[PDB]
Amino acid sequence: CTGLALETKDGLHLFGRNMDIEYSFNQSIIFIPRNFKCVNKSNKKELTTKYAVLGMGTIFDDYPTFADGMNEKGLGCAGLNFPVYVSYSKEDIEGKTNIPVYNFLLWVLANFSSVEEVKEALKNANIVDIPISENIPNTTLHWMISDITGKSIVVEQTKEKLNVFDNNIGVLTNSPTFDWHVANLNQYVGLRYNQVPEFKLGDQSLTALGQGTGLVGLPGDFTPASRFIRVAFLRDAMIKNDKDSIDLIEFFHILNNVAMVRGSTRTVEEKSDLTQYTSCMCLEKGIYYYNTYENNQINAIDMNKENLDGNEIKTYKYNKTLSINHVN
Amino acid sequence: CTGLALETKDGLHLFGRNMDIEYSFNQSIIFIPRNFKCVNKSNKKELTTKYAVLGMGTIFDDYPTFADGMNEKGLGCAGLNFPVYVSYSKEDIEGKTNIPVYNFLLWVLANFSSVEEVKEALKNANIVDIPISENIPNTTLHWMISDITGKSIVVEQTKEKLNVFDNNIGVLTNSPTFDWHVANLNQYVGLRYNQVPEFKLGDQSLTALGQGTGLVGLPGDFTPASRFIRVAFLRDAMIKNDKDSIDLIEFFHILNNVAMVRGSTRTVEEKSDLTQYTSCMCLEKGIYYYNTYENNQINAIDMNKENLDGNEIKTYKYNKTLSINHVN
Amino acid sequence: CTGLALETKDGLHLFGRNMDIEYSFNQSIIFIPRNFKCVNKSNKKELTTKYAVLGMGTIFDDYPTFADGMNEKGLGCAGLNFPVYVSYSKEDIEGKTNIPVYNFLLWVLANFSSVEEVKEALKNANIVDIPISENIPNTTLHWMISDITGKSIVVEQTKEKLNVFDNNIGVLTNSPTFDWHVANLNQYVGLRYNQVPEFKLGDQSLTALGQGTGLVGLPGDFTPASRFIRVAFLRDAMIKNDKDSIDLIEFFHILNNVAMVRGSTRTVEEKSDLTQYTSCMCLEKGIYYYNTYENNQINAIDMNKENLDGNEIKTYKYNKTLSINHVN
Amino acid sequence: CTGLALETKDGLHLFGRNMDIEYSFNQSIIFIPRNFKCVNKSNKKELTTKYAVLGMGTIFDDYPTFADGMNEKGLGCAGLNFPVYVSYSKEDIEGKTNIPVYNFLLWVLANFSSVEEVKEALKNANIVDIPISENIPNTTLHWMISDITGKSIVVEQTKEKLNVFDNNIGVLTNSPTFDWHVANLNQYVGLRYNQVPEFKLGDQSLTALGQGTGLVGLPGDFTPASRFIRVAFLRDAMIKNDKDSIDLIEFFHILNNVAMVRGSTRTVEEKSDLTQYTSCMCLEKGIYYYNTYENNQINAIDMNKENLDGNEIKTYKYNKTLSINHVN
């Protein structure tokens, strides 16, 4: 998984992710209107939305749970895989705001209008490993939260503390912890976006074979660490050199570089791990953009075309049918 | 530049390329019907097409010159940048079939129905540095040619000889010579597509942080050598593990991994080198598919919808307008 | 800097380091006998040795301070550069065992007989930035401590806490923190010591060009992170495959791989950072072995040849004169 | 295997190699005087030395064959492993100077006084796969030749031609061909010896963790290609920055970086491939210097202490006994 935040040339804020998994989670694009009561059946925990919500998720036991999404106030949140280093409590901790793993994303979007509000609420928060239904284990997760101010935070629950990091890199992947990846960036201070055309090796003259010699050393595999490095520097380069031309498609160009391709990232169960979808949320405008591995055309769902005071959850079918423009 | 050949699950043959340049060459999709007379003005050299042709190129002095394209018989050819190691003759060489650099691609597509025919004709061929007009220098090039048999060849003119390589890798990039890249592949025999979940480092247990640990060592930069390695192995992995599911979109997934992103591949003239377009030719069906940096939706031009016995060159506008599916 | 601990085929324990600096620190091999009173002049802080000590250090204002060393009980300690992530207190912290930076190494060796004793004493310890003389700033440091049990620990003072890590890797370099390097090891789970002779790339057969194809991906630069990875895996491979043949020279072979070479690691002040010396302590036998950049022959100083109840500090001249065996 | 040529601060010329093998070849240091008749028994081929010779080799059937060596005129030659790309003739080729593989090194040293003389003689030369005895296959080899002018050449016999390359890099390893490695150097034009202390990643400040950030991207494994890159750049850096301080020990420092360490380079037969010895020839002075994996002290054999008009081959025992300087 790879999360990305980017500001457009027009001062708007994009936030989204690659979804990298080997299976379907019966996903659909889910819209939840304001003041909507969401009730879980296995437990008795209830949630009423303050703000209208739009994102990718699934309806499990009539209850919505999200992979990534936005609200009407321009707050975005994405849940990304976080194995090994995560640690949830088994039960609710007395004196803390206890949030079940499966519900954290919705809890953020339904209740808060900004990263600042979320940061304050998370000070006394605790993420609990409570099943959504039956005995079903929760996915190991960490979250990236971003809003219209351009500020992003990273939420990671460890054994010692629920950590909330200021994210000044604009990216997130998977394990290890966020501060590890931040420290790892320091290894690549010698990278250059500008071409190195020549090198005089004493009595031998060396000449650049093609463009891109400055970035030699950039890791090209699909591990969380390597992907973090790649997107961090691709994002940096475009902000440095092309701030005034950043638009929607650029977001997809960055994430395409770290997208997994069928066949080459094989699990222990002999399945291909691939980038199933790429989402991009235009936070100010309430538009959820996404494409999929099967259909690369960007699809747009605009929450502002909905009745925000509506009385029903609305879903939209996950598009897996390649859309081609037949010119002639 | 990156060229790719791929066979689909249905036994059809895809051939295409990423176009990686920092400028526009006034490109359009160009269709040339059968028995069409193409005349160059600066010189008096003439060409009459035996087969109908469809591809990306430009009309320079009313004369068409191509970046990549196909003919009605399922033969495809792409011209890719080849600096330093290339060497064209200044004048026509007596006793040889002399082909001007700018005309080589059209010469292949207009005259021959197969790689086998092309191979035979190239035995006595010579590529000459003759200007298309005035004093204008030709681009340093090498070519990949592929047909419906699934065979591909690489054409590289050096000082000593016009080299024709059998391409069993299914890919091409830029400099150095093709045999160099073939030998370079041997360095990466230790790559694995299958996950390496653990390593016992004596008294320390090491655990995979995420998926993709087998490919650690894969180069992630945008140099011709690194891109060649990446596409060679991405292609191999998908053929090995997913032969029966290869379709059109998979071709784009492979090439997306080596596509240049705005800002990070900067020329000496402080311009961004980017993947301007990606083309994919369905050789059997005569369909030219392509998308662009600005518009990622795949566009299709089917030469079989044209009158192949037509009397005029037809062009189609290079699509740079992002095409979004507005769901609601 | 690189620290290493290794057990020999005969069950003895080697501990030592590469000293990687661009300057001389007026070093000599320093022996301090038992019950010897060491007094610092700028402050009034005094130290009386419980155990006899032998190592590399310098006499600054008649007061000894060490780079690395051992005591008569088989306890070894090395101080290695630790910039950025270190944080010493400005003054003594009330209720804690306050140790000046420059004195920490001697404090360990003079007082304690084992890693276990040191671990217990460090629970309430604090490292303070007190000048050795005048206003002179202390070097940013972290320490590796090892004994005859084969156990090693790493001591790192941060803002929050004095951290004591169990070192199961057997190595140490520089920044970042120890736990960062431990987590970084996980990236290289795909490394193999055994040759990969071939790879079948579909229609192309790939063959290993030479030995060592399994380790492709190992970083070859001289940064702390890369050096940590290299020595960790070189050590692991030899323990795995050659446990019963490990001897003194093997220790040097491992460290030679991460030794800096004149000219290629240049500081901002245009000086060559090099491996000035390599020390190896045979902990059981009280022998300090070392060579230097100028003289690669191993020199041995045996503390047991000294009077351990002696009344004077003894020093031995740092050997920088290449020692050659003239055969004929 | 790694070959290296280096000029000292005093204008003298060093030439030598790492011997990287998993076995002993019953090696000794062999001196052959002038006008000495060497006769092979299996065939009837004879060789009379014009110049006195000194190097590492073995006496096989009373006949000397060399791994590397020098003559009295300051000409040096080393044979290095060259699998796959080599191709010797089965029989003598009519009209050519036919040299058996096992005899090539001695043929160079015994007959010629300079690289220039050797270059001229090799124009009509052919290397033949004739057994030294019985049916025993020859080792796949290529050679580096160097003299007191500071010029080096590389000799590689392929199917098409006996290739003689001018070596302006000062190094050699193994497969692929020399021109491949020369072209491979171009990939690393972005390497820097000077520290990169900082990088401003937008809103995140990145700081060098330690020295050596400029060389990030240098390959750290033990394959021929990676070793070639490392020594080429280590040599370049020292000539660039430390020309006036290059001496004997520097030669060893460079080669130590690419020396194989027991346990980590394992063959298919589960044996450790290691750097068995490192030789360095002071060409002007006729001194053969070497150390071994077991004994790192440099040993010196001076051919000028011998009777060059002597009547017997003299050998010196390969030193595998660690030589330590006991200081006290």
Ligand SMILES: C[C@H](CCC(=O)O)[C@H]1CC[C@H]2[C@@H]3[C@H](O)C[C@@H]4C[C@H](O)CC[C@]4(C)[C@H]3C[C@H](O)[C@]12C
């Ligand atoms: C796909 C998404 C994000 C995880 C990721 O990016 O890897 C995850 C986060 C929490 C997940 C859900 C929760 O873990 C609860 C359920 C657990 C079951 O094992 C699968 C369905 C289930 C309803 C999950 C579906 C899906 O895998 C969710 C929604």
Ligand SMILES: C[C@H](CCC(=O)O)[C@H]1CC[C@H]2[C@@H]3[C@H](O)C[C@@H]4C[C@H](O)CC[C@]4(C)[C@H]3C[C@H](O)[C@]12C
């Ligand atoms: C874009 C394409 C492929 C090169 C590449 O992939 O880098 C190249 C190949 C030959 C080129 C053409 C020929 O070199 C002839 C012309 C040369 C002029 O300098 C530009 C226009 C000109 C008409 C070129 C346009 C364009 O750059 C072409 C068509």
Ligand SMILES: C[C@H](CCC(=O)O)[C@H]1CC[C@H]2[C@@H]3[C@H](O)C[C@@H]4C[C@H](O)CC[C@]4(C)[C@H]3C[C@H](O)[C@]12C
């Ligand atoms: C060389 C050694 C280890 C540091 C390293 O490995 O980089 C360091 C550790 C503490 C150092 C000493 C202490 O910092 C105190 C002194 C500080 C002065 O700036 C130099 C001399 C001085 C007496 C130092 C000499 C030397 O650099 C020491 C002994």
Ligand SMILES: C[C@H](CCC(=O)O)[C@H]1CC[C@H]2[C@@H]3[C@H](O)C[C@@H]4C[C@H](O)CC[C@]4(C)[C@H]3C[C@H](O)[C@]12C
């Ligand atoms: C060790 C040296 C260099 C090869 C290398 O660097 O890998 C090689 C070159 C030619 C070799 C010799 C020749 O191939 C002829 C003999 C062949 C037999 O298989 C071994 C002994 C034999 C007498 C070899 C000993 C040794 O391996 C030599 C001397």
